[PDB]
């Protein structure tokens, strides 16, 4: 459709590499504990100061349309490493740059770049198998704290709060990072069923100190449909008044007649009653109301599947809770007097629904519901003086959470780039099929030294001598870039998730080996 | 999305500092009692002439996109100091510039800027602890006048007019700065319940001198809903006529039939009656009408929670006031004959609602309601010849009010930048963990002299000699920039709020230490 | 309409060839097993890395409007070869460039380019007849795997799964290439009737493990129109309950009364019943419902042609299936207890409708229906680390599928360009009518060596010496570009489809011989 510019051979490959080396030099400065931080100008407001590889990579676009192709491919590498792993984007960026450079240097007239790519993938599969061979499972919370500390730029107070959250809500539990209005971070553990729905009317308040609505051992009434008529709410009030028990009515809404009855009974005779909207808008609303009915111990009125009417209310069919807190912004239920067998059956139903869904938005909803039935959720509030500090620390806390989850799921290997340095003996025992696959095997063999070299280079010391001292040392001795000496990496706590390393290596290698098969580059003419 | 320009190392850090030094030189000229004033061009009309640090900072944007990043970060420093404290924005600006300069000068190949930042925050926490150690509470109104005088550029009349307002309406009372049409400032104390609602009909006037509607010992009828029918207003008029007491009807509105009845009864037989609209539009109208219900001694008719009907009106159901003044623009109620216990209970309810809200717009409403139930509010009308004078003086009056509130809340330390000069012995007793945290501790140690140096530099004298004479003097002796000698600064009245100093230092240090961790700057290409 | 630029003679033919040689040099680098790969800039997102001839050709447009004509004509050559054959676009591109060059070189004052074109088409018809003479039918699945391996750039793991898919679903069966979320490719064979329609209500689930709705030996009720009334669904439930058989109701939709009846019966008494929407929107919905009626063994109710009512349902009118699985996204029917004679009659009807349609969108629908009634369909999921890998491999899998189908339809000749090299003895036995047709015969004779020369040139060796060794060898000996030696092409497995070769040659030759009749070129003036 538009006029094109076509470039051939090494005149193009030298240009695309110029886009890689420009984008992978702004990322490699953020690697390791001694790496520095990149400021990106934001158009709407204040600049974004970040140490994240995928945030630096995604913000670099080049005016030259031949360098922009290499920039976009390394952006793809970093973005894929962020998507599948959540950490190790800088390592993937520098590995992709190294593979691109080594593959561009090795292209000759008789060379076959496709067989070089095949050798690269064969060597990478061998390295991934060796990484899975040398992994160890996480068995103690000390290793959890060590992983979260290493992944958060050596911040011990972030590892110690993520480890506490995983100890409280479970290792496979819901932990959410949130903005904080204080100077220091904090951890909030939410137990029971708390939903962001307030009371319908402010006259239900019986606690003057916190402006809350609090009862003990309260009856629970639930409904899918809106409650409007007098006859649909009076019999539940008769069960509440006869047994002398408080009532909380969770519904879609309570309309004018039912509201008038509830507030008039609350203010005049002294009946204890509160009305709360139900959380959700669609099928999640139905699922949360059914979860509430299972946890409380009663049946939920007005379901579409089964004919249940609010006109006939029985005492066994109303739920029971030991504690209910309803405020203006949220409502909270604890100690539901349900049956544990049905709660476990609902947990199994949610787990089996989780195992078959892939929408990435339903999964969060069923995880939240499962955590509400389980020990609860955790909220890490990140504190700082300004929004820039909060965003910078929130990036590191999110990276630490993702790396802690990846270490839970798969395992831990040595950190500091020393995991890939012990997979070079695995590459030295490979027999290439032809001379072209040997080139790819040597490319991958020379690439495994790059992360440790970059970590040592950002620390100011010479990367090559440090790496050569690492390989000549024992299998447990590695360089500590913060302290500057050679230590036992497991004992000192420098460990990495296996999933992060084997994701970064593969996602770098595939895209870079596909890039190094290029001869002709077609771009648009700059209008 | 757009083409980017990427800069590396000291070629970028020298540019961003050029945006800091440009922004923090236009602010540092306004520091101290001998500081000068900055004129900013306004596009719509007359230029804005101001001495406020945050107003000068927020008005500076630079065409170079590398200098604009440093400009935006110092803007963030000034804006955060203005939000959290309301004063000390120039001090935060100059502290941020000094920390940025000292951190940029100390970056080498082997240096770790993250550990330098950690040392900076460690030193800042030590200085903040020392500042809280040496603070004194405000115990006399003389110190209140001294704080408001120092914060208003040495204006003794502003300090006196704020000390008098705090003596009249209370230290934690509502004081509002307003435009004045005279040459001199004035203070207006509004007692009782005054709301900006006039009478419905001009025929209710019984005072010819001021065109006001005034009664003594009047009945009060309050209506939630609009009054339209004859039967909803006649029985209240029967209670008013039988007891021979004036009646004021505060409602949403008075419609045609009730209005015709009221004006016809007022003009024909001589019944004393006035109708006023209710202040507010939503829930604030409900809360204000309830406040008048408790304050007057009656119950508000037509409430949604409890069925109250205007058709049956009892003499105990009507409030009583000792004084009512209704004009065209406002209505005024004093000496309500309510019960003091219920008034105190309503005050406690408003206070407990204040302690749990964070919307920053509801807080003003509950503060206004609490002050209406309390001694009252104060209005400082700022006088001047032109609008530029009123705006320039209003900035200083607002700064004095914010600093007086901050001195009430936390305490007072020595002014003139001498509060931070006595925290250098606190820094000299710190043991840094490594060589990189020692750099940050020395950066903060060299930064604590900067406010006193800037104050002395704006006075024309040499800052370094003055600071060295301050540090070699006693703990109470400091420089007086207005008079030019070394005086006992507590006895002379040069004091500062502790909250302002410890806010400016922290908000400068966090953002500037985050800025000094930069190596790569990514900006947009100027199209 | 617009101002035109007119060029005459060799000043124009030298320009248009400059557009051919620019477009056919970016394609010829992708030829053979040692050919390289072209990166094309995409405006919206990541660049497209590809080896396809027609994708490289269609993405090249030139700013010069005289070169763009030759570029557009070679684009037409590649696009026609892609439409008619699906493979061999690079061969057609290089043959078109060679014919254009040889015809442009031979134009003189006395030459007749129209008779040169006539000689070109005469020689091409002779070569096509010789190619059809030397073809062999595909008789073993080993040749199928060899063809799919050669067409997929020597990937044995693609040819193996394509051969397995053709062995499972039949050689003339539906095979669909799809995106994969894994690292490796996979093959999914779908048997029976599977349609992408879920259940109406989630309460029909009776399998907790997979959240599926599964029965065995179930009755099937099929409805053309929507089911809403009570009386239209009750008698079918009576047949289901009396015989104690599960029921699946495939309809347009099930409305509120019927849904309430179905879920209430499913939850209360325990009747096994599921409601599924019908697949399709128009006549395809009718045809699919009729096919399900024939396969299951019942009659579809509510058809427009014949008056069938849901109020009277007989046990013989309901279909029977041995296994039904209904999930949220799809339904599955297997082992329909229909009559084989009517199923074969429906298969014959679908085949006879296929033989008379040419819309290219109905053909896919009847092929899908025929495969659903036949062994089933196959889905090849292409795996990769990133989207670029998946697209690059999907192009080769799509090429291998099309070449395998073309080898099924017509036959196989020698690969590596050795098919056209054995048709030059066929050209040496032609007697030209005049001197101008002899020029075209010699042009085609010199063009038949071009594919083998290009394959040998991309391998780094000299094309002319390799070709001259090929024609001096036996009829079965050809160059293996991957291994670099002269081998028996049939025994080593280097074979090509006859249809692909005879399509590429003809589509190149016609358009290039029409191009070589040019004397005057009229273009638009570049505004
Ligand atoms: N004290 C340390 N000594 C040596 N190596 C360390 C130390 N702390 C961390 N590392 C190593 O530094 C690397 C962490 O680098 P960094 O976190 O900056 O980037 P990343 O994980 O590749 O990507 P992302 O920017 O997405 O976090 C890991 O290889 C880790 O093992
Ligand atoms: N007579 C004085 N002698 C010495 N120092 C003084 C005197 N009066 C005020 N100061 C000091 O000068 C500073 C006041 O500066 P200024 O009010 O211009 O700026 P600020 O408070 O930092 O910010 P803002 O511009 O927002 O008001 C305080 O440190 C105060 O203690
Ligand atoms: N190992 C081999 N040795 C020799 N020739 C080979 C070998 N493998 C394939 N070929 C030949 O290379 C050609 C395949 O080229 P290629 O697949 O790149 O292009 P194409 O089929 O013309 O078009 P498209 O780009 O659409 O796939 C065929 O002529 C095939 O016979
Ligand atoms: K990083
Ligand atoms: K100032
Ligand atoms: K090709
Ligand atoms: Mg990390
Ligand atoms: Mg001030
Ligand atoms: Mg092909």
UniProtKB/Swiss-Prot annotation, chains A, B, C:
Main location: mitochondrion
Residues the record lists as N6-succinyllysine modifications: 7, 58, 101, 109, 167, 178, 181, 194, 212, 226, 277, 328, 372, 457
Sites of Phosphotyrosine modification: 66
Pfam families: Cpn60_TCP1
Keywords, in A-Z order: Acetylation, ATP-binding, Chaperone, Disease variant, Hereditary spastic paraplegia, Host-virus interaction, Isomerase, Isopeptide bond, Leukodystrophy, Mitochondrion, Neurodegeneration, Nucleotide-binding, Phosphoprotein, Transit peptide, Ubl conjugation
Consequence recorded when altering residue 5 to G: In HLD4; transfection with the mutant protein impairs cell growth that worsens with increasing temperature
Record-listed N6-malonyllysine modification sites: 109
Family in the record: Belongs to the chaperonin (HSP60) family.
UniProt function note: Chaperonin implicated in mitochondrial protein import and macromolecular assembly. Together with Hsp10, facilitates the correct folding of imported proteins. May also prevent misfolding and promote the refolding and proper assembly of unfolded polypeptides generated under stress conditions in the mitochondrial matrix. The functional units of these chaperonins consist of heptameric rings of the large subunit Hsp60, which function as a back-to-back double ring.
Protein name: 60 kDa heat shock protein, mitochondrial
Organism, scientific name: Homo sapiens
Gene name tied to this protein: HSPD1
């Amino acid at each position: 459709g538009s006029a094109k510019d076509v470039k051939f051979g090494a005149d193009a490959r030298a240009l695309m590499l110029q886009g890689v080396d420009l984008l992978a030099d702004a990322v490699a400065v953020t690697m390791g504990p001694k790496g520095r931080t990149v400021i990106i100008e934001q158009s709407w407001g204040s600049p974004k100061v970040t140490k994240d590889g995928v945030t630096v990579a995604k913000s670099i676009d080049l005016k030259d349309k031949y360098k922009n192709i290499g920039a976009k491919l390394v952006q793809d590498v970093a973005n894929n490493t962020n998507e599948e792993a959540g950490d190790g984007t800088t390592t993937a960026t520098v590995l992709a740059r190294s593979i691109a450079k080594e593959g561009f240097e090795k292209i000759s007239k008789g060379a076959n770049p496709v067989e070089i790519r095949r050798g690269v993938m064969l060597a990478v599969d061998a390295v991934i198998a060796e990484l899975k061979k040398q992994s160890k499972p996480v068995t103690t919370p000390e290793e959890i704290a060590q992983v979260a500390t290493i992944s958060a730029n050596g911040d011990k107070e972030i590892g110690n709060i993520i480890s506490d959250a995983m100890k409280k809500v479970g290792r496979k539990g819901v932990i959410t990072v949130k903005d904080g209005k204080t100077l220091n971070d904090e951890l909030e553990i939410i137990e029971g069923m708390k939903f962001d729905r307030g009371y319908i009317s402010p006259y239900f308040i019986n606690t003057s100190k916190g402006q809350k609505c609090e009862f003990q051992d309260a009856y629970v009434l639930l409904s899918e449909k809106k409650i409007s008529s007098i006859q649909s709410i009076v019999p539940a009030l008769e069960i509440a008044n006869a047994h002398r028990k408080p009532l909380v009515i969770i519904a879609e809404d309570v309309d004018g007649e039912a509201l008038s009855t509830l507030v008039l009974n609350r203010l005049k005779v002294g009946l204890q009653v509160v009305a709360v909207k139900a959380p959700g808008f669609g099928d999640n609303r139905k699922n949360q109301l059914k979860d509430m009915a299972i946890a409380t111990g009663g049946a939920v009125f007005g379901e579409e599947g089964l004919t249940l009417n609010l006109e006939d209310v029985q005492p066994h069919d109303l739920g029971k809770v030991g504690e209910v807190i309803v405020t203006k912004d949220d409502a909270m239920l604890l100690k539901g007097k349900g049956d544990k067998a049905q709660i476990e059956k609902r947990i199994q139903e949610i787990i089996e629904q989780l195992d078959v869904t892939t929408s990435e938005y339903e999964k969060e909803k069923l995880n939240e519901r499962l955590a509400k039935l389980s020990d609860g959720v955790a909220v890490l509030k990140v504190g700082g003086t300004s929004d820039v500090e909060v965003n910078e620390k929130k990036d590191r806390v999110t990276d630490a959470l993702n790396a802690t989850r990846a270490a839970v799921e798969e395992g831990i290997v040595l950190g500091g780039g020393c995991a890939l340095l012990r997979c070079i003996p695995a590459l030295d025992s490979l027999t290439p099929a032809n001379e072209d696959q040997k080139i790819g095997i040597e490319i991958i063999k020379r690439t495994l030294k790059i992360p440790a070299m970059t970590i040592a280079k950002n620390a100011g010391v010479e990367g090559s001598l440090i790496v050569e001292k690492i390989m000549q040392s024992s299998s447990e001795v590695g360089y500590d870039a913060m302290a500057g000496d050679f230590v036992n990496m497991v004992e000192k706590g420098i460990i990495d998730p296996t999933k992060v390393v084997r994701t970064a290596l593969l996602d770098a290698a595939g895209v870079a080996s596909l890039l190094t098969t290029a001869e002709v580059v077609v771009t648009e003419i700059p209008k």
